[PDB]
């Protein structure tokens, strides 16, 4: 075995060659000097990370206020207009004319049902709605199993027709406004602008189940939070039909809860216990509700009934106060069938003062007495529901939000405050949105105090959407490096704005589909959950980020600079970087806005070329006709002007950008001049580099390509023939290697992928990249990244020239921090280049982790596609591992043993790169393999919620809530 000194001299020559090649061929000092040469075509402006946060906070507050002022207008007109409705019961003569959505646009049908008349709309095609809308009238949605032609429905379509003027006036005062909806308490939803519903119920074979009364914006604006305790009866007499109806009913009731409410499902049969692992009230988010649904499905019926024990258990669950609660509405939902006990002593002892409501549900079709259950419901300010079949479940499990809203109505004008919901996926295919809600009250015979009977329920809920692509325009991210970004947060932890929040449902557990039970044409539902991704699940979680999160959940403004791990764009690496979080509260609302800036990004370049001559010279340099002189050029699909559109085929886009910069005078009145000025100055600098320096040495020995990625969105691959093997994103703020090479202070090596479709390991090469760092007036600035593709074959030639090609006594490998094979010694390894080392030689990898040359960090990705297991793609949680260099030590000399074996090894880390070199006794000598150390997304289900509820994350709930008014009626039950 060779010695440490000969090994060290080997690696010294290796690093010398690699680094000198990359440096002289990529041309870093050249680009540094031609940036610092001009220094007068641009200026260096600062990023006052407090001023930026405050400006964006005001812009967001202004937007949400503009949306609020459009809601009170709608609610005022709606109250005033229904206050003067006549309630006629004849319509066969005086028709209601209206555009029913989800009616077939085939003009040869002529339905025009009794009592009502249709509208054939014009339907221009629009942007801001990726569909065809008509600004002339409002569309109406009526649930499939609700006749449109009732007297109740035809009376809502008669007085809601007065909303269209307010809809139009709201839209003309602010043309950037998305859907406006009035969702009524009879099932209707009247929205503007008119647009056909995604699903006709039966015209295609996909029927739709959309009820406005269950949309979370409605349930959010229709009542305060809760402290619900479901109390299932699993005595013996419920077995059979009513038991399975009880299971389906409890699930459909849990689906009417939010992340502001707390819940628990208990269960009694001569003894009350918890249905699951929880044992108190838990927060009713998607994971906890998955636990409680899976626990309710495992329920069996046996024993004697005893209501006193069940109600003692319930009322003692609602008195914990050692745990976190909503503290507002304490209610008990008793899912039973019937019986002969009423338990008056329990209620007289536990809620003599009637702070808890009781809603009792009598499920199934049986003969047991129902007197006591109605009494329980009526004696305890609650309500009584009957569920005889599966069709009754949906409407009877959402109807308690009428009882819960009588105190809100009675509170009068203190109850009308605009609220904003979690982030959910729009129903009309618009992306992630938040909705603002405001309840509408029924004021009929109000001025004289005449009725006050139907005047304890709300009429409906008004709503107005705000997409997230609309919030992300008030936080423009193109003056910070690829590494800084804005992000906002609830007073709940959840994230309203983050680089890592995709438009897909949050997954829980592993999905398991049963093919053998799925009829081919039965239209299973899709999804209704919101996209509630916590903050500490969108980033890597330190101990400091927890304190920042807590510190800005309760609206403090502050700043903190620390050192953290940053997971790379593609989840394969992990860096260490200095960051600065500066946060502030959004004053009008409960949101909080933060800005993450890496030091070295406290200064940016602002272009200063206004001259027709310079700008024309530069704009010449990006035109396909002469790529030969400048090498393949890519342009970032930013929003330079509101006239050209990002096209996702970058040749089309570069052509358009050219014909626009000319075809529209450099006045550019509708164009962002800082963006395109930066792009032009940038292409100028890049092309100076390509012309003067690169094009001299046309062919370097081992080089395969040479690229420059920069800010301003310019990319240049030098030999045009190489530009066909360049697969990176053309928008430079999404290039993984760019963000990685800005973090490090050396040459970052990116390993290719493995067994990937496409020429990716041998025809392309291995990518080296170093970031340009210039000093203008003592100020650091990293404006570009230069790079190289090293050819594998020339590398092997330099690598092999005491371990030799396919030698069977020892292995000589090179890895990068991450453990991905780069340069082997075996022609059988070298065939799998870019593959995780612990997947090809796991014993040595596990030992390297043990002696701590490699550390690692594990995380969960909550938004991933899954191949459904056995018990086309579902949403599940995946676990992600990532390895990195922890011990900054340079050499590790040791011996790894598996038992009766022995393999002596030496590893040495190359200096000024991120590469490691391992020389180890061979593997075929010792027939000892343990198990593959896989680094890949593995579909998982953890963490275990039963333990997070014992130590939950800090959280701050609403402080305004309306329960227990005194003028309440409760003669309805």
């Amino acid at each position: 075995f060779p010695s440490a000194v000969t090994i060290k001299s080997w690696v010294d020559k290796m690093q010398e060659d690699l680094v000198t090649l990359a440096k002289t061929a990529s041309g870093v000092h050249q680009l540094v000097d031609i940036y610092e040469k001009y220094q007068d075509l641009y200026t260096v402006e600062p990023n006052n990370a407090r001023q930026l946060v405050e400006i964006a906070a005001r812009d967001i507050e202004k937007l949400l206020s503009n949306r609020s002022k459009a809601l009170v207008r709608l609610a005022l007109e709606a109250e005033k207009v229904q206050a003067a409705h006549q309630w006629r019961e004849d319509f066969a003569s005086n028709e209601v004319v209206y555009y029913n959505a989800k009616d077939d646009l085939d003009p040869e049908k002529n339905d025009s049902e009794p009592g009502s008349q249709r509208i054939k709309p014009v339907f221009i095609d629009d942007a801001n709605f990726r569909r065809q809308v008509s600004y002339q009238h409002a569309a109406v949605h009526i649930p499939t199993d609700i006749y449109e032609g009732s007297t109740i429905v035809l009376n809502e379509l008669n007085w809601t027709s007065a909303l269209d003027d307010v809809f139009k006036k709201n839209r003309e005062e602010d043309p950037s406004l998305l859907w406006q909806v009035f969702g009524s308490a009879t099932g209707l939803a009247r929205y503007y602008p008119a647009s056909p519903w995604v699903d006709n119920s039966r015209t295609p074979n996909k029927i739709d189940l959309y009820d406005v009364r269950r949309r979370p914006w409605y349930i959010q604006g229709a009542a305060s939070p809760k402290d619900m305790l479901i109390l299932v009866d699993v005595s013996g007499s419920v077995s059979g039909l009513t038991l399975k109806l009880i299971r389906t009913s409890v699930s459909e009731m849990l689906e009417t809860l939010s992340d502001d409410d707390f819940v628990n499902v208990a269960s009694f049969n001569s003894n009350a216990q918890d249905v699951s692992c929880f044992q108190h009230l838990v927060q009713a988010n998607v994971r906890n509700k998955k636990v409680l649904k899976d626990a309710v499905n495992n329920i069996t019926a046996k024993g004697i009934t005893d209501y006193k024990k069940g109600f003692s258990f319930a009322f003692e669950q609602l008195l914990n106060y050692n745990v976190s609660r909503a503290n507002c509405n304490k209610i008990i939902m008793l899912f039973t069938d019937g019986g002969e006990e009423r338990a008056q002593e329990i209620f007289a002892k536990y809620n003599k003062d009637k702070k808890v409501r009781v809603f009792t549900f009598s499920v199934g079709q049986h003969n047991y007495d129902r007197g006591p259950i109605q009494w329980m419901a009526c004696e305890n300010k609650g309500y009584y529901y009957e569920i005889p079949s599966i069709g009754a479940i949906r409407i009877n499990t959402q109807e308690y939000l009428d009882v819960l809203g009588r105190p809100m109505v009675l509170a009068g004008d203190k109850a009308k405050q605009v609220q904003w919901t979690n982030v959910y996926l729009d129903a009309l295919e618009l992306g992630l949105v938040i909705t603002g809600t405001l309840p509408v009250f029924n004021i009929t015979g109000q001025f004289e105090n005449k009725t006050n009977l139907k005047n304890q329920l709300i009429l409906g809920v008004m709503g107005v959407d705000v997409s997230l692509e609309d919030i992300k325009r008030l936080t423009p991210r193109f003056t910070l490096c690829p590494n800084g970004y804005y992000f906002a947060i609830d007073p709940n932890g959840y994230v309203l704005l983050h680089p890592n929040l995709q438009p897909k449902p949050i997954g829980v557990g592993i999905p398991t589909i049963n093919l053998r039970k799925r009829r081919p044409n039965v239209q299973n539902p899709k999804s209704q959950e919101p996209v509630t991704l916590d903050f500490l699940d969108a980033e890597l979680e330190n101990d400091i980020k927890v304190e920042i999160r807590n510190k800005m959940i309760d609206g403090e403004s502050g700043e903190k600079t620390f050192r953290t791990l940053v997971k790379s764009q593609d989840e394969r690496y992990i860096d260490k970087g200095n960051r600065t979080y500066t946060w502030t509260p959004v004053n009008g609302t409960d949101y909080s806005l933060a800005l993450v800036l890496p030091t070295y990004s406290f200064y940016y370049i602002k272009a200063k070329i206004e001259e027709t001559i310079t700008q024309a010279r530069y704009s010449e340099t990006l035109k396909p006709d002469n790529f030969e002189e400048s090498g393949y050029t890519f342009l970032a699909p930013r929003d330079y002007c509101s006239d050209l559109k990002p096209s996702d085929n970058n040749t089309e886009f570069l052509l358009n950008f050219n014909e626009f910069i000319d075809r529209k005078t450099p006045n550019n009145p509708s164009c962002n001049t800082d963006l395109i000025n930066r792009v032009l100055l940038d292409a100028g600098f890049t092309n100076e580099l390509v012309q003067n320096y690169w094009s001299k040495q046309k062919n370097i020995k081992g080089v395969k390509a040479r690229f420059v990625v920069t800010d301003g969105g310019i990319t240049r691959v030098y030999p045009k023939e190489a530009g066909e093997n360049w697969q990176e994103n053309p928008e430079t703020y999404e290039d993984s290697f760019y963000k990685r090479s800005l973090d490090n202070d050396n040459y970052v090596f990116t390993a290719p992928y493995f067994n990937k479709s496409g020429p990716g390991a041998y025809e392309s090469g291995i990518m080296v990249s170093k970031a340009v760092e210039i000093y203008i007036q003592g100020k650091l600035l990293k404006p570009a990244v230069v790079g190289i593709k090293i050819d594998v074959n020339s590398w092997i030639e330099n690598f092999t020239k005491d371990c030799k090609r396919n030698s069977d006594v020892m292995d000589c490998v090179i890895l990068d921090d991450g453990g991905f094979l780069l340069m082997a010694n075996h022609d059988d390894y070298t065939n799998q280049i870019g593959r995780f080392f612990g997947e090809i030689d796991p014993s040595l990898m596990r030992h390297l982790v043990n002696i701590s040359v490699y550390a690692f960090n594990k995380s969960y990705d909550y938004q991933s596609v899954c191949e459904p297991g056995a018990a086309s793609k579902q949403s599940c949680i995946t676990e992600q591992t990532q390895y990195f260099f922890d011990n900054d030590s340079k050499s590790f000399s040791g011996v790894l043993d598996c038992g009766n074996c022995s393999r002596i090894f030496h590893v040495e880390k190359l200096m000024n790169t991120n590469l490691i070199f391992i020389m180890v006794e061979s593997k075929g000598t010792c027939p000892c393999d343990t198990r593959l150390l896989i680094q890949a997304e593995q579909t998982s289900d953890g963490p275990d919620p039963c333990d997070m509820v014992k130590q939950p994350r800090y959280r701050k709930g609403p402080d305004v809530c309306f329960d227990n008014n005194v003028l309440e009626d409760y003669t309805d039950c």
């Binding site: 007499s237 077995s239 059979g240 039909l241 038991l243 399975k244 003969n367 079949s389 599966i390």
Partner: protein
């Protein structure tokens, strides 16, 4: 009422009106089985 009383606890939604749940119903079921009309359906409910 002894043998099949309260044992029709089937977890489907099919309605089996001829059961033995209380005395008037058991009397009706036995009468129907005497007249012979559909006694086999009652037998299948009993065997399941």
């Amino acid at each position: 009422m002894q043998l099949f009383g309260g044992r029709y606890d089937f977890e489907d939604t099919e309605v089996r009106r001829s059961n033995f749940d209380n005395f008037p119903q058991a009397l009706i079921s036995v009468f129907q089985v005497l007249t012979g009309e559909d006694w086999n359906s009652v037998m299948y409910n009993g065997i399941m």
